[PDB]
Structure formats: structure tokens, C-alpha cells
Amino acid sequence: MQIGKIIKVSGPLVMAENMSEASIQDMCLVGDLGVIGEIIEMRQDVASIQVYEETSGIGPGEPVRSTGEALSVELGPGIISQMFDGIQRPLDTFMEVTQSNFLGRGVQLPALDHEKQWWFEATIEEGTEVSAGDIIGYVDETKIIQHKIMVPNGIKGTVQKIESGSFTIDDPICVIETEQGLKELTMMQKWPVRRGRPIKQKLNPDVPMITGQRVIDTFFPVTKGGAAAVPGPFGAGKTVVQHQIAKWSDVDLVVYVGCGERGNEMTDVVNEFPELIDPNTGESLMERTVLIANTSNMPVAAREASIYTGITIAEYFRDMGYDVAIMADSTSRWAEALREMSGRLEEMPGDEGYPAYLGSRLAEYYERSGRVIALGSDQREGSITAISAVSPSGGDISEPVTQNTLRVVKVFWGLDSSLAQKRHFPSINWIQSYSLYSTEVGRYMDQILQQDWSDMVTEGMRILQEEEQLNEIVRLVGIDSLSDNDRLTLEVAKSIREDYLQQNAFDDVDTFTSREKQFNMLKVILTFGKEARKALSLGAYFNEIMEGTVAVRERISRSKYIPEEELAKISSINEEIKETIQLIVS
Amino acid sequence: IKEYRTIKEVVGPLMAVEKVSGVKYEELIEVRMQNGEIRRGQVLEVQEDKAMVQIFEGTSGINLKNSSVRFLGHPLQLGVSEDMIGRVFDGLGRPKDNGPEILPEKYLDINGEVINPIARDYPDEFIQTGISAIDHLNTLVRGQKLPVFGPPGAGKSALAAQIARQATVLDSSDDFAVVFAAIGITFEEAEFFMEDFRQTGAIDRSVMFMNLANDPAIERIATPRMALTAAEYLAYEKGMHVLVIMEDMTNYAEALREISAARREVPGRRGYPGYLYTNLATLFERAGRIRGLKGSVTQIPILTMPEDDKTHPIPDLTGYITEGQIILTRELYKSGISPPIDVLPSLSRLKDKGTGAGKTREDHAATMNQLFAAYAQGKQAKELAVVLGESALSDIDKIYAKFAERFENEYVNQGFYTNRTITETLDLGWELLAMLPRTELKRIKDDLL
Amino acid sequence: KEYRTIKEVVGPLMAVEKVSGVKYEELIEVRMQNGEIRRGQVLEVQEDKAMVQIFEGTSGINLKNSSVRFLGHPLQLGVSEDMIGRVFDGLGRPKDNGPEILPEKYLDINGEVINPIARDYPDEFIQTGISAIDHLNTLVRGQKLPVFGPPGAGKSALAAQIARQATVLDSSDDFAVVFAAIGITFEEAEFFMEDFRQTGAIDRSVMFMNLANDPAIERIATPRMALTAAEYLAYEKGMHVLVIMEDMTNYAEALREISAARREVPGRRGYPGYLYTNLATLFERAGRIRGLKGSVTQIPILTMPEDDKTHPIPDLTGYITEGQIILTRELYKSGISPPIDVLPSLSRLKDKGTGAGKTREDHAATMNQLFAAYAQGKQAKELAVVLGESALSDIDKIYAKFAERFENEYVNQGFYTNRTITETLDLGWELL
């Protein structure tokens, strides 16, 4: 309605007059080209706009249009299985609409397909009193995921008109009688991405997530609503760990966020992630994933808004009652984008050039993840679990991005290159990694399994930590200078490492280990330890225990491959362990 | 009701309002946004008919033409009432529990007053923290400020909660309240503190000011002042001894940096405000006693020890201000050592006014000095005992190390829910120099009794 | 329309009044009072006023009697297939006195950003003929693989050598070379140019030569000129283009100088603070595009600091690049040509460039344990300088000698010997 006029262009900064109807942080289309920018300052009617794209060829006199809104996302059917950039520009649609392999300046395309017909199935009755969060109907958007249609925030009243049928996301599918009169609802809502979507209550994330990856589920678990940090050094198998979590976790949707990555790395992601197969259905993971992809040469505001765009989408699906995993790679690159944007704004630096608000920004993002009671009369539960890659230039946890992340997250999975050398995968350092959820998860695991699993985990960790010390005794003096108990500790530690921690993501059976299978495997490991300890104190020698146990020990190491239907073949190992050693003590 | 529709200018979180009068420096404001939203702010500068304000929650979404600024006519203040006991607030004193808003006795400038130097009274009585490594060797005195330095996640929060749980004044007809200030901690850490307070009923003698990691930075700066204003009110107007725990003051320094950079105020000497020390003194000086009054304010700042890095809130910088240290290490905490207080560098300069008969038994000092010295070298013995090998082990040096190992495992590792009274820890300190023959005992007068 | 309205000249900057229709980054011509003509660029534009910067400086100019013409377009490259074999300066104007180029079209030298879903993953193997690279730190088409070196340690010799013996195995689709000299001396430039002519490599090359004493503002344009030509040959003619740029350290310094001259806000080490933006906008201009034949591969050449930071921080470059190739002085004193320290050298993309159907099949395995002979070869002798005579001598006896061979023959190929990869593997086994 109001067209402002450019009065100054200087690099990325554009000043436009006649903008008094716009607001701070409004997005704008600037110039004849209509390149995207953001209002950062306002003096009477003159707005200062930081332009995201190249300003070459733009000068005074040209127009500026405010979009009337802050940087936002469209939320509705058609968002699942799409590949966006950091500001929700649809990359596939861009290629066909522009007939180009490049992101050209100032092309404007809606994030979702507004022409596509969907079958809306109504599930609420007319005359019902509704408020934000209530589900009025649904759309079977993909073969996996049901898109639930909710009353937007700010809307309250009585359902007057609602019928099932075939609509676009632009068509009025519902009418609601509000204090301000009749308001029409479509299948799409918009939300500003720098604002967390409101909830009824935040909860403690205390329910363990089943990744099926044994080292994580057992020694460094993450809860639904928790967050983990992953160092991602080179040649450490980070990408395979990430795929493993994405396809095997007991979450409903995955949101992957690539923040300003190298073009070739990002091409890897955009190619490999679609080829990932959903276990339960055999369909592509993209049928329940939303992906955001940015390279280093894309506009800085896209790279800086990447994680907020992703987590706003995640919050939207969490409000539906779903569990979401948001995976960000790499938050160090996102912080580079933050630093650059701070430099452009002529701000005063903090540590290592990062702005003084780096910690605050990271905290806002991570405190937007978690388990919640969402809005709506049914008071459904949802969760966002965050898995965030850090990748420092030197690879250090003392640098500001990683220190500030570890201030607010409770899980740390330290990937290690030396572990990847030894062909020990996943290369997760079991001495440096930690999970501050492990106590609470132990409580949960005990009540759910009706076994004393927390103690088993603590004992296995005691054995691994003891192995680290005995290995240095083996370094300073010889291996032959150890007690038979000390040698037994080293052997049971090798069993934990090779028979439990080591997991082949590409083997059909090793790729995923259920909770119950994990329990039976670990108790097999530990009972070998236990009965051999007893036979050691009973006069038998560790060499007699070892030489007499080869076959059952090979049944131990092969237990990872037992099908989930034949779990007794693991539990029966316990019997064989007790019998053989019992005849070894004669 | 002073309210203007004259917003001329917005640059970042700062606004300029023109054609005003009667506006004062540091006065609180409200922005009434065109969309019904309401934000709080502060007058940073005022000149002729113009006023420069800063918005706590920032200026995103504001339309200048259609927004207004209300000038409240007072600075940041806390409405005080003895009914604050048992309640839970945010960093700005707003109710965080679903109970009622309180009717204040009065409203107090959260900056406080500056005590007349001849009106201040020296700290002189004892406080029972229940943690023996403190109550015994590093005694805390009513009116003192004793900080706790610690590594990340190493039972530091558990110690905070434990002290707040197990804190009282012995044999005293006066009341003992606790004010708890959380500074920029996460939701999960705050939930830990809040419902731990209610499982033990500590909440019933407590006031809590909860600032979270994603709250505005100005609220971090205001939170300890809110806490201390409440504490001073309780102490010097209700006669109570108030213990004030502020958890993660390191987050406070980061908030100061953030505020300074947003205000382009101080070219940061270290990126850090030059007044970090001075600001901190403004807080730390708010502890002590006033002669003629039976109340007391006592402070326990809790900080993250710099992880052997230079750019941090330096301990020695705090060290001038503070009247001691209580240092925790993970090297001890991975040993199951909880509370993991490394007793060697810990110091409490004001201990004599607390380690007094009528508040403790007379063995306190002498106990302390030989427990300290005999562990002090027992460690050195054991370190040299492994580096020199199990073969190079001397007799006097096989017995020195014993005390050290047992001192860690039993004298410090009491656990986070065991409240060892002072009588216990005295007995319990001697119980282990019971290995030490009479031969190295600091006194000989009343070793018997 | 010429504007006779120059009101201010401060340093290399000019203020022009009462213009309209002037656009940011638009090129200008100053017609001086004495008839001289200088070329310039709009850096700020505000109401009816414009602030420009003159490439040749402002010395000798009289404001009142000079004029400015606004050309209505930014820095562009006139492109044509005919650019092969020719030599230009940092602005694409001919330096070789040769016939004139009639451009097919003019292209903005800033370029486009590839849509990430349109990009193709690097795949093919490039035989540099350097064993130290081809085996341990393999170069793939579409990769960005920089090399770092001290001054006069033959890193430029290495650059000309890769430019010389770089090829692909099918070699049905031609390999073009775009060479950019960035603020180097006349003698360095002559090394490159006359080498290119004597070996005949010039016949598949396009050269952009900016010299150490050319205006820094033109030094900023040079790499973008090179890359615009490179992308034109790759994506519009289907060619596989290798891009060598020395010395990017000089590009960093020219950026620092320009930002200082424009009274901007200094970032780290006084460097403009958009070094990541600028260097990434340069380096991410490599790769392959799905559905198109050609490719762009970049090899930046950097002067390694060897001092108190105060250099084009590699960490930035290495954060955008997919590897590092390191040259140190101690291999140059030993006479080792080319002096690559294989230990800190990395190829982030060697994996799917090398393998079955791409190279001989011992290649990987011998690499993945051929580092180890050098790893524990110098773990004895270099570390144990003091204990050298006897510590670890009876055992690990040959692990020194084979390391000496690794330096003396395996990596000391010579700056003029082309090692086929299979030939390289034969040497690799014989050393074991």
C-alpha cells in the first residue's frame, strides 16, 4: 500500500524514505529488483534496511515495499519433504520457476504450493468452542505423517462452518465466531521465526529416546526434549552417526538444518538424506523430514536465520502432539554468520570477535527445544530434541561456541579421529562423553524393564574407566605383570568395547539394537565378567578361564547379530556361561 | 499518567522520544506497541525535551508512529513485604508461582543506600552451613561474603541447594531467612532448585528470584539487586539474619558485557566493562551488619571457575572484594568426592569471629590447623608415593598419606543430603587424627578433653 | 551525459553532485582537464550525490574543469572462447599486444550463487603428476585445494608445475587452465608467462596478471575476473577448468588497504572483517552443476604466516576449502622439489575421487599405511635429536632410511618431472 523511496545505497545498507507504516524488523523488497532486506532502524519516516542480497545496480529513487511482517515461515500442508534455504525459499520450485541453476536476485516464490489440492478431513463439530492449538481436522500429507490443522494463536470462539473436502491452503476451510466477528481459517498459518511458538507448560524431558545405537542409549542417552552436542571432526563418521539417529530414533519428524556449509559437503547432505529409507515403512525419510540447506556464499541472514527457521517448523509440529528431532550442522557456521552480521552492524565485539550476545542467542535457541504441554483443550504433549554439530577451526571445546553450547545442553557425544583410525565405530569417546540425563534415564529404564539396569550401566562404565588406568600400567610395566583379576578386567573391557560399543550401521541387524536386546547383551557381557571373577577367586587361573571359554565367548561377540525375534538365543548364553566355567572349577 | 505518542527514532534496542518534560534519568518506562504488546525500559539519557530509552525485550516489531511511551516516574524498585517468604519471583520481582501478587509495604530502589562508615558493624557471629569442610575449616560468619568457585556441573548446584537447605543460626532468638537468586540458568536447573526447595520445605523460609538463560540481559543485571534489596529489607527492618545465595555470577558478568556493547557505552577493556570489578563491589558491599540493629546480610556468590582460560571473570579480581574462597574441583569430583571442596586453597579470612566458644568447641582452631597440615603433606606423600613407586615408601610417609586418602573419602565426601552439625565435624575431625599418635598434635593441654 | 559537478576529492575518493540514476557499484570515467581518462567505481550513492573511487588515484586532477561519465554498468568481463591462449591484466584488458577480442557477451564478475540442489558432488580424479598430492592428498574436479608456503620456497614453482602436468584420464574433454596472478612482482609474473609459452601450456590457458604495483582496487577485481572466465568456459562450453591464484595473501592485504582508504570499521587484525564473506564468495565458485558437462577446480596459493598471525588467516580459508597442501622451508633447504610436508597436508575429498574404476586399486591401501612409514620414520630420528645415536637404533633400524627415501626420491620428484599415478604407485611399492 505504502511505497517507500530509496534515498541512499551504501554496500549492504539501504535507506528509504516514506516508510512510516512499516515496523522495526519488517522484511522488505528493495529496489526495482525487489531484493530482500530487513528494517533495522527508523528515524521518523526514514528506514535503514540491511539488504540480504547484492545491492549492485540499485540506487536512489527506486521503490521499497514492506511485506508487513518480520521474517516468518509458512506452516501448512506441503511443508513436509521439502528442501528450503535458511529463509524458507523452496529450492526445487526455484529451479523450475526460474529455469536456472542459480539463486538470482529478487525472485519471490511462496514457500508452499498454494495451487495444490489437498483432502481436508474435518474432525471437529460446528458449534464447538475452540482456542489456539485445538485440532479442527487433518490432512494425510505424506505416506507417513498426518498434518493436523490447529486453531492459530490469537483465534478464539465457536466453530460456525466446517466441512471436509478438497481445498488449497488458500481456501477458507473453517469459520469461527469470535469477539471481533467471523474469521475464516485456511490450512496455512504464518509464524515469525525469532519468536518461540507459545505453549501451555514446559516439562522436564525425562523419557529416554530409543536411538537403537547401543553406546548412546546405554552410556550417554538423550531424552525427548533434551539436547546433545557433537564435535564432528574430520574422518570420524559423523554423517553416518547423524543418519543413524535420524532414521532410527523413535521421533515422528526430523528437521535437518545445514547452516552455511561448504557447497560440496551440503551437496552430500542433499543427495544422501533423500536416499535414507524409513525403517517402519520402507519409504524415503523425506516423507517425515523437513530439510534446510545453506552454503557459505548464501546471504548471511539466511545462514543466521537457518536454525530459527528450522526450530520454528519443529515447534509447529511439536504443537501437534509429535516428537521432533532437530539436527543442526553446523552451529559453528551459524555462529560465523552471527559474527559477520555483527560486523556489518558496526557492533562492539566480544570473545574472539563473536558478538557479546552469542551466549544469549544460543540459549534462546536451545531453550526453545524441550518437552511441552501444547495449547489446546486436550493438553497434548510434544517434544523437540536437539542434536547440534559443533566444528571449531582448531577443534577445541574451550572456544566460545562450544563452551556456550555446553553451558545449556546436558549431553555431549565426543567424536574422535583416533577411534576412527582403530576402526572403532561409532567413534564416540567413552571417557570424554557424558549425559547429565543418565541418572533419570536409569530410573526410567529400571521401572520399564523390571530389571536393575542402572547398576549394570554403572558397572560397565566402571570397567571401561578402570581399563583406561590399567592400560597405563600396561604401558609403564609389562602386560605379564598384572593380576589375574586385572587381566580379567581388561578382557571384559575389550568385550564391552568390541561386543557392545562397536556397531556397524550398515549391517542389517547391527544397525539397530532394541532396548530389550541391549539389556540381554549387556547382562551377557557382565555375567561372563561375574562368573569368571568367582571362578578366579575359586582357585582357577585366568588362562584356564580364557582357554576354556573360547566358544561361548565367540557366542558373546556374535550376539549383536541375533535377530530381534530370536532374543532367547542371547539370554540362553547366560546358561552356557555359567555351566562351562562351573566345570572349569571342576 | 504521563504517556507520549512522540517516538522519533529507534536504533537497535534504543529509542528516542521527543517533546517530553518532567522525565528523569534512569526512570522506568513502558512502550505501548501498536499491537497491544507492552515492553519495559529505562531512561538512558535525557536532554532538553528528548529522552533516550532502552527496551529490555528489544524493539522488534515496533511501529514508531502508532506506539506510545509511558513514563512511570520512578526507577527499578522492589515492593517489599514480609510475605515474600515462601514465594517465587522472576528477576524483576514478578510472581513466578501461581499465587497472588503481594501488597507491598513500600517500594525500594534496588540500588540500595550507602552505609555510613561509622554506622557499619563488624561481622561477629556464627552460621551453620552443615557442610563440614566449610563450617569447620572455612567458617562462614554472619555478615561475611564467602564465594564458591567451581567447575562446570561438578555438584556445584547441589552444594548451593544443600547450603540453602541446611542453614540456620544456633542458640539464637532471631529469625533466619534465605534469599536465593538464580542468574541466567536454564529451565531444567531452575526446576531442580524450585522443587528441591519444596521437597524439603526450605521454600517456607526462602525467597527466590529466578532469572533464566533466555531472559533479557538487563534482568540478569537487576536480579542480584532485587535479591539484596529484599535481603536488606528483611534484615534491617524485620531483624532477621538473611543468607543470600546467587548462583552463577559468571553469567552476571556476561550480561554486563552484553549491556555495555549494546549501549556502545564503555570501550571494553577486555570486551568486558571496565566497571565489572566496581559493579561487583556495589553488590558485594551490600553485606554485613549495622550497629544498633539485630539483622545481618550474608552473601555466598557462586561462580564457574575459569577452565584454565584467560578471558573469564578472574578469581583474583573477585579476590580483593571477597573475604575468602571455597574452591571445588572435578579432579576430586570424578573420585566420587561430594561436596568436592579441595581444602588446600580454600580460605575464610573472617573465621575467628565464628570459630568462637559459645558457637563452637575450643578445639576448632587447633583441630583445623593439624587436620590441614597433616592432609597438606599427606597428599605430597601419596603423590611422591606413586611417582617414586610402592618400593620407595617410607614409614612416616606411609602414615602421612593414609590420613589424606581417608580425609578425602570420609571427611569431605559426606554427601549432598547429610547435614553434619558442628559438634559432629569436630568429633569426626579428631576421629581420624586418632591414627596420628599424640606425637604431632598442635596442642597438648586438653587433648584428653 | 558527462557531469561537470565534482565537488570533493579526498584521497582516491571523489564526490559528484547533481546526478540522478546512478547505481551502487556502477563504473565511471573521469575525463580530466588535460584530456586523460581514468576509470572508477561508485561506492556510495545518496540523494543527488555520488561517492566514487578512481582506480588510478586522483593525483593531478582539477575538480572544476574535469567531468565524470556514468557508464551504467559495473565491472564486467567480455567473454569468448577466443580467450584461450591470451594474456590479460587484472581487469581483463589485453596484456599480450595480441588481436582484439570481440566478446560474445559481458558478464558481471560477482557471479551467481549455485542453488545447493543444483550442485553436483565432486567425483573425478585429477592427475597433478605430483605423487605427494595424487596419492596422499588427491585432487578431485570441483574441489578447492589450497597450498601454503613461505616466500621463495618454490611454491610458485609448484603452481606452474601443476598448471603444466594437470590432466584427466579420459582426456577426451579438454582441461583448460585459468591463471590469476594477484599482486605479484614482474619477475614472478614473467616466470609464469614465459614458462607457459615455452612448455606450450599457454595453448589451453587464460591468464589474468595483476602486478604488485597495480592499484589495490584492481587487485580486488582480479580473482573475480579469473573466476568469471572460468565459469564461462566450464558451464557454457563444457570445459574442465583448473584455476590457480597466486598470491591470495596479497588479495587479503589489498582488501585491508581498500577498507582503510574507505574509512570503514576495522575487524580482526585491521582486516575488513568480511574476509570470510569475500574469500568464501571466491572459493565457493568451484564445483560441478547437475545437468552440465564442465567443472571448475580451484587451487589457491597462499603465503604461510611463519610469524605472529598477521596473515590471511588460513583457518578462514581452510574453513571454506576442502584441504591443505603445506610446504615448509626445511624441505626446501634439503633440496626436495616439491617440498610437501605430507603430515599436515589434507585432502578432505580424496575418498570418492580415488577408488575402483577411478584409480589403481592398491592406491588407497598403500596411502593409508604409507603415511605410517613416514609417521614413525621421523618419530624416531627427528624427535630423538639428543638420543639419536642409540635410542631406537637396533630395532626400527630401517624406518629412518625409508623416510629418507620418501623425502629424497618419492617427494623429491623435481619441479619438471611428470609422474603418472600408476608410475607413482610403482615407486610407492618399491620404497616399501
Author numbering:
A (entry chain A): 1 to 586
B (entry chain E): 2 to 450
C (entry chain D): 3 to 434
Sentences from the paper on this structure:
The designed B subunit (De), expressed together with the A subunit in Escherichia coli and purified by Ni2+-affinity chromatography followed by gel-filtration chromatography, was found to form a ring complex with the A subunit (A3(De)3 ring complex). ADP molecules are shown as spheres. c,d, Superposition of the computational design model of the designed B subunit (white) and the solved crystal structure in the absence of nucleotides (pink) (chain D of A3(De)3_empty was used because this had the highest resolution data of the three designed B subunits): comparison for the entire backbone (the Cα r.m.s.d. calculated by MICAN33 is 1.48 Å) (c); comparison for the designed binding site (d). The backbone geometry of the designed P-loop was almost identical to that of the design model. e, The interface between chains C and D in A3(De)3_(ADP·Pi)1cat(ADP)2cat,2non-cat.
V1 is a part of an ion pump V-ATPase, which transports cations across the membrane by ATP-hydrolysis-driven rotation. V1 comprises a rotor composed of the D and F subunits, and a stator, a hexameric ring, composed of three A subunits and three B subunits. We used computational design to restore the lost ATP-binding ability of the pseudo-active site in the B subunit of a rotary molecular motor, V1-ATPase.
